Design a protein around this nucleic acid. Structure first.
Ligand SMILES: [Zn+2]
Lengths: 108, 122, 433
DNA sequence: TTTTTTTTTTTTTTTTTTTTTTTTT
C-alpha cells in the first residue's frame, strides 16, 4: 500500500509521532550511534543511527525514520548520502512547505 | 504530445476512463512522463529488469527492457517512461533510467511537479 | 484606524490611512460574459503594504481622487484574497472598493512612512541581474521618437518611447516608456531643459549590456525636490553637458532581455521565427531522442574551415573551400535532437560545440566508438537522453528549395542548475498560493 | 463576481525532417 512518507523539517516532528518521515540535514556531530542534524527549519534533530552507518564522513544526509515518542528524536530506517567530501537547504525548506501545501500530489 | 513531471501518487491517481484507453491526469492526456524516486527492490528477468520504486509519495514498479549496474538499492533515480496498467496493476515502461545528479534535483523535481500541475489546472 | 496589516475579511468596520505608492491606468477588457473597467493602486503604512482595486463605478468615483504619493483615509471596502499572479506585494489579501467605500485625504502624513528610494548609480546597474525591480535617478539627456509596434505575443500594437538617463558615473543608459506615459511625455513641462527624472520600480534589462523598462506599477517623477536631484542638478549644469558619456551596449528594445524563458508551447504558440527576424528564447527541456542517422559529417581538417569534405578519385578528402585534400576528415556534429517539456515537444539542431557536451564526446571519439560496435554506439546516444538542459536558442526561417521551414538552433546549452531552477519555481508556485 | 506587464539582437557547419521502451507482468 505504501503510505506516503512526509518530507519534513525539525518542527513537523510533532505531527508525526510514531509515523515514518523523511528528513534532510547537514550532519553536525556523530556520538557513537547518535547523529546530530541541521534541518532546513534551522532547528536541530537527533537521530538514533543503525550500527552499520559511516555517516560521519558525509555532509548532507536524507534520513527515512520513525519519529519517536518524546518530540524530537528519531530511529533511522534508511539513510541517503548527498554533498561531497552543496545541497540547497533553503530550497529544501521551501520544498517541505510546498509539499505540505499540496497533499493531492504528495500524500493520501 | 508531452512529457509531464509527475509524482508516483499522481501516477496512481490518474484516471483511465474505463476501456483500455489513455490515462488522464488533470483533464489532460498522460503520455510520456518523468519522475525521481529511490530504488528499493531490483528483480532481473531475462527479458526485462523490474525495479521497485518509491518517492515518498507512494511506490510503483518500473521495468526497462533488455535487447545499468551503476544504479543500486537506496539510490535516487530519474525515470523517463509511460504508464501502463496490465490487469489493474500499474507500472511504468522505462526506456530511460538514470542516477540523480545531486540531491537538489530530487527537490527540483517535486517543484516541477507542482508547477506543471498548477498550469494544467489553474 | 487599523494598520493595513490587521485588515482581514473577519472584520468589517475599519479604516486605513495609507499613502498610494503606485497607480494603474484604467484598464478595460472585452470578453464572453463581461465588459468594463478596473483600476488598482498600492497602499503603504507603518505596518505594511496592500493592493486595492476599483471596478467600473469606483473608477469614476475614485480614479480622479486617488493620486500617487498622497495619503488617504479609506473606509468601508471589501477585503479579498490576493490574486498574486496580478501583483508584486506579498500580502495574503487585497482590497476591493464597493459602493459604500469612503475616501478622504488626510492632511496628516507624518505617521505614514514615505517611499524610501534605494537608488542605483547608473554605473552600478551591471551589478543588478536582469528581470528585477530597481529605483533609479538621473538627468534626462535626450529622448527618442514615439514608436508604435505590434508585439508577436500579445498581437496588440504598442506605443513606445526611449529615454537616455545619465548621472555622476558618466554612464548613459536607455529607459523605455510605455503607453500613455510614452505619448503624453513631451506634454510634461521642463522636459527639454535637461530634467532630472526619478524612477521607482523599474525593470533591469540586458539589451545593450544593461537597460531599463517600466511596469504598470513603475513611477517616474519630473524634477523632484529631493536633495539628490539637486546634487545632480548642480553637477550637470556645471560639468555634465560638458564631458562625454558611455552608452552601455554589449533602433531599440531598451529594458528588453535577449532571450526570454519560454515553454515549448509558447515558442510555437507565438510563432517564433516564422518571420524574417530571428527570435531568441530560453527553454528548459529534457533530451528525449537524438537522431542517429546523419549525426555527423566529415569536415575540412583545415583551420577555421568546416566546409564538408568528400572522397575524390584518389580516395582522399577534399574541401572545395581551402582547395586541398587530406587523409583525415575532421568529424563535426550536425546534431538533431528532440526535446520535451510539460507543455509539448520540439526539435532542436546543435553544432559541434553543444552537441559534444550533449553526448559528452567529440564526434571523432563517437565515430571511433561506432567502428567497434553499434551496441556501444547507440548506448552512448541513449545515455545522452534523459538529461535536462537550459537551452539558449534562435528561431529562423529556411529556404529548402523554395519551401520554408522553421528550424530552432541551440546557441548555448548549459545543464540545469537545480538549486537555482528550484528557487525560481518556488517563486512561481508561491504565486498561486 | 469581474484582468496583463509588452520591445530588441545574427554562423559558415548537412540535409531538409527526423522516431522515443516495444510485449511481459
Ligand atoms: Zn576548407
Amino acid at each position: 500500500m505504501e503510505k506516503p512518507t512526509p518530507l519534513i523539517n525539525s518542527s513537523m516532528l510533532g505531527q508525526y509521532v510514531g509515523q515514518t518521515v523523511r528528513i534532510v540535514g547537514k550532519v553536525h556531530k556523530v556520538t557513537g550511534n547518535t547523529l546530530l542534524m541541521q534541518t532546513s527549519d534551522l532547528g536541530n534533530v537527533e537521530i538514533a543511527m543503525t550500527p552499520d552507518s559511516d555517516v560521519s564522513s558525509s555532509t548532507f544526509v536524507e534520513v527515512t525514520g520513525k519519529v519517536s515518542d518524546a518530540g524530537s528524536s528519531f530511529q533511522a530506517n534508511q539513510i541517503r548520502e548527498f554533498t561531497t567530501v552543496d545541497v540547497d537547504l533553503t530550497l529544501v525548506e521551501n520544498v517541505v512547505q510546498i509539499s505540505a501545501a499540496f497533499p493531492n500530489l504528495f500524500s493520501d | 504530445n508531452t512529457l509531464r513531471p509527475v509524482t508516483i501518487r499522481q501516477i496512481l491517481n490518474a484516471e483511465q476512463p474505463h476501456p483500455d484507453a489513455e490515462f488522464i491526469l488533470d483533464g489532460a492526456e498522460l503520455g510520456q512522463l518523468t519522475f525521481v524516486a529511490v530504488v528499493r527492490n531490483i528483480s532481473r528477468n531475462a527479458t526485462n529488469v523490474a525495479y521497485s520504486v518509491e518517492d515518498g509519495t507512494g511506490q510503483i514498479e518500473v521495468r526497462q527492457w533488455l535487447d545499468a549496474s551503476e544504479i543500486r538499492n537506496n539510490v535516487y533515480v530519474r525515470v523517463l517512461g509511460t504508464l501502463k496498467s496490465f490487469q489493474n496493476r500499474r507500472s511504468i515502461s522505462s526506456g530511460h533510467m538514470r542516477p540523480v545528479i545531486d540531491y537538489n534535483e530530487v527537490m527540483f523535481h517535486r517543484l516541477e511537479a507542482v508547477h506543471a500541475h498548477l498550469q494544467v489546472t489553474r | 484606524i487599523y494598520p493595513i496589516e490587521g485588515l482581514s475579511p473577519y472584520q468589517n468596520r475599519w479604516t486605513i490611512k495609507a499613502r498610494v505608492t503606485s497607480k494603474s491606468d484604467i484598464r478595460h477588457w472585452s470578453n464572453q460574459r463581461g465588459e468594463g473597467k478596473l483600476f488598482s493602486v498600492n497602499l503603504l503604512d507603518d505596518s505594511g503594504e496592500i493592493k486595492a482595486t476599483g471596478f467600473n463605478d469606483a473608477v469614476d468615483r475614485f480614479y480622479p481622487l486617488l493620486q500617487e504619493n498622497h495619503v488617504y483615509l479609506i473606509s468601508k471596502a471589501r477585503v479579498n484574497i490576493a490574486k498574486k499572479q496580478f501583483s508584486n506585494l506579498q500580502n495574503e489579501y487585497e482590497i476591493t472598493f464597493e459602493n459604500s467605500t469612503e475616501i478622504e485625504e488626510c492632511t496628516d502624513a507624518t505617521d505614514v512612512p514615505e517611499v524610501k528610494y534605494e537608488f542605483v548609480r547608473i554605473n552600478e546597474l551591471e551589478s543588478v541581474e536582469a528581470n528585477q525591480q530597481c529605483d533609479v535617478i538621473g538627468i534626462l539627456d535626450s529622448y527618442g521618437e514615439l514608436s508604435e509596434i505590434v508585439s508577436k505575443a500579445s498581437q496588440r500594437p504598442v506605443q513606445k518611447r526611449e529615454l537616455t538617463l545619465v548621472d555622476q558615473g558618466n554612464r548613459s543608459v536607455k529607459l523605455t516608456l510605455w503607453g500613455k506615459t510614452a505619448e503624453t511625455f513631451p506634454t510634461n513641462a521642463g522636459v527639454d531643459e535637461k530634467p532630472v527624472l526619478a524612477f521607482k520600480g523599474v525593470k533591469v534589462g540586458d539589451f545593450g549590456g544593461r537597460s531599463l523598462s517600466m511596469f504598470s506599477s513603475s513611477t517616474m517623477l519630473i524634477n523632484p525636490d529631493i536633495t539628490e536631484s539637486h546634487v545632480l542638478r548642480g553637477w550637470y549644469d556645471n560639468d555634465g553637458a560638458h564631458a562625454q558619456f558611455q552608452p552601455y551596449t554589449n533602433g531599440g528594445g531598451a529594458g528588453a532581455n535577449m532571450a526570454e524563458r519560454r515553454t515549448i508551447v509558447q515558442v510555437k504558440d507565438e510563432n517564433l521565427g516564422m518571420s524574417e527576424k530571428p527570435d531568441y528564447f530560453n527553454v528548459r527541456a529534457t533530451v528525449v531522442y537524438i537522431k542517429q542517422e546523419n549525426l555527423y559529417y566529415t569536415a575540412c581538417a583545415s583551420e577555421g574551415c568546416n566546409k564538408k569534405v568528400n572522397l575524390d578519385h584518389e580516395n582522399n578528402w577534399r574541401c572545395e573551400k581551402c582547395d586541398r585534400s587530406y587523409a583525415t576528415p575532421e568529424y563535426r556534429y550536425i546534431l538533431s535532437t528532440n526535446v520535451a517539456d510539460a507543455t509539448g515537444q520540439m526539435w532542436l539542431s546543435g553544432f559541434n560545440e553543444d552537441a559534444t557536451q550533449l553526448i559528452g564526446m567529440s564526434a571523432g571519439e563517437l565515430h571511433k566508438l561506432r567502428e567497434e560496435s553499434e551496441s556501444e554506439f547507440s548506448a552512448a546516444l541513449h545515455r545522452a537522453a534523459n538529461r535536462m538542459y537550459m537551452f539558449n536558442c534562435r528561431a529562423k526561417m529556411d529556404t529548402f528549395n523554395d519551401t520554408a521551414r522553421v528550424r530552432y538552433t541551440i546557441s548555448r546549452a548549459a545543464p540545469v542548475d537545480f538549486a537555482k531552477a528550484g528557487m525560481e519555481l518556488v517563486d512561481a508556485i508561491r504565486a498561486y498560493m
